[PDB]
């Protein structure tokens, strides 16, 4: 069984796909695969808030469900319903999918096309988070609004920015195209490397271009080349204005503050 | 400093008369202010195409840049240059308009006189596109004329229809405002969800004149939220069917068009 879709960021609608997925596995007596498709048609338009994640954060996500396999999007793009399924799922009784799936030039492939073929198609039902039906977009607007207390409800988990490198570690993202975060200041956890776990003052500004500075709360050291993954906890103020210090030394005091108060709710 | 004038539609030459207002308050080390004047005259005279967006869009875009206040035409129509001064220019060293700038009694206002009590005014030349002023007008003369593709030249974004969700397709709900209608026909748009989620849509302008939607991909009950309508391209003239089957037909046409071209242009950026 096949479950397809792009899957950025993994949120609890994509873990009920996998989920269904894995048990309809079972009860086929069939293997498990997930095909992620590398970008969705919007990624290439102007206005694409960018995704929740790399595609290869995504898919050491999704391997930690199925077999996990990428559907190039360059490669794909063009090819019809027919060539896509005879490429792509020969031998494959069943596809999991999520609702309005589409495939091929024009989108002219949907699961009505995969039955037609002899492909039993599930297709999963959105979930919905209070009122809204939990989805990438939704998670990528709050991400840009800032509003990452009310993640969770939707991803499974905190938002988070991934990359390498007062003082503040300049995190490098990649090439990809990343969503950004309503420019501002940040409470983040800070996972460092060999399991390390220290919070963290991060600031999100312009340098078009986006910067992710992270001033780490009981660390010197210097992680340089090494890789950072912050959990993006809370949005404490919007950007500002040298008095920077003063700020970035309330910050980084109402830290400690929501800090302790975390602790003390034992 | 402050900036002055109606900005329909917040298009090109109004973003530049707003940069120049934000540049001379970054130089004085001020803070700007928008008066935003609700209507144009010609608002409430004969044969008026409508505005391009409501007052409420209008303070949401010009919101972006500074502190924006709304006047009232009629509260100011009436006022006599200095009424106006008086009443809304204390201590304000400059003023950024664009051309034409008038204000207060038979529009005996101008940047001449409020140069005059000693503030400095900043005319912007219209901004030219294709040999031609950007002007609210003039995007509004295109909408009309269904020419939505030649828009973002001028306007500097794609003309929307936005309001309320009054095969299944959303009738829109523009609201109450007087808002200049598209050439009656069928029209591919870039629907913009209340989630976050952007869809691609067929829409259809027939016959107060009736905008609906049909959303490609999507499923669920839109009644009582907003839809924001990037209006893409002009497909086909409004046509009348003497028979309900070729109706469906041309409607299964549509997606059909709309699909191939919603594939052109990802493609076509590269
Ligand atoms: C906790 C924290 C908050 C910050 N907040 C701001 C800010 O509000 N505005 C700003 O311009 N720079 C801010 N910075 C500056 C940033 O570290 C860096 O010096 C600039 O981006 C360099 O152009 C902040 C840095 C830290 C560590
Ligand atoms: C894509 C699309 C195209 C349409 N084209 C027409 C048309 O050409 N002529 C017409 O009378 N109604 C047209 N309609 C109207 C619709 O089928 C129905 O008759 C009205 O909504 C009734 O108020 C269209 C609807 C859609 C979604």
């Not at 039955?115 to 989805?135: A, T």
């Not at 983040?188 to 390390?196: E, I, N, Q, T």
């Not at 780490?216 to 950072?228: A, K, N, S, T, V």
Request: net charge positive; no cysteine; hydrophobic share 40%.
């Amino acid at each position: 069984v096949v479950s397809i879709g792009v899957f950025d960021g993994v949120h609890i609608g994509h873990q009920k796909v996998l989920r269904t997925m894995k048990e309809i596995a079972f009860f086929r007596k069939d293997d498990s695969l997930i095909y992620t498709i590398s970008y969705p048609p919007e990624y290439f338009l102007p206005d694409f808030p960018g995704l929740l994640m790399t595609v290869e954060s995504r898919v050491e996500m999704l391997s930690r469900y199925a077999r996990t396999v990428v559907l190039d999007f360059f490669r794909i793009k063009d090819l019809t319903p027919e060539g896509f399924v005879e490429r792509y799922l020969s031998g494959v009784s069943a596809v999991v999918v999520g609702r309005d799936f589409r495939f091929g030039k024009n989108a002219s492939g949907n699961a009505s096309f995969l039955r037609k073929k002899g492909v039993e198609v599930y297709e999963i039902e959105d979930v919905v988070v209070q009122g809204k039906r939990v989805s990438s977009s939704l998670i990528r607007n709050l991400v840009q609004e800032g509003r990452v207390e009310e993640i969770p409800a939707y991803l499974g988990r905190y938002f988070e920015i991934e990359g390498i490198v007062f003082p503040t570690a300049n995190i490098d993202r990649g090439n990809e195209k990343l969503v950004d975060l309503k420019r501002g200041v940040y409470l983040v956890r800070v996972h460092l490397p060999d399991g390390k776990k220290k919070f963290g003052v991060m600031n999100v500004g312009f340098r078009r271009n986006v910067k992710y500075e992270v001033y780490i709360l009981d660390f010197e050291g210097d992680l340089y080349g090494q890789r950072l993954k912050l959990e993006v906890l809370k949005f404490m103020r919007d950007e500002k204005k040298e008095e920077l210090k003063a700020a970035i030394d309330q910050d980084v005091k109402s830290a400690r503050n929501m800090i302790d108060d975390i602790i003390n709710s034992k």
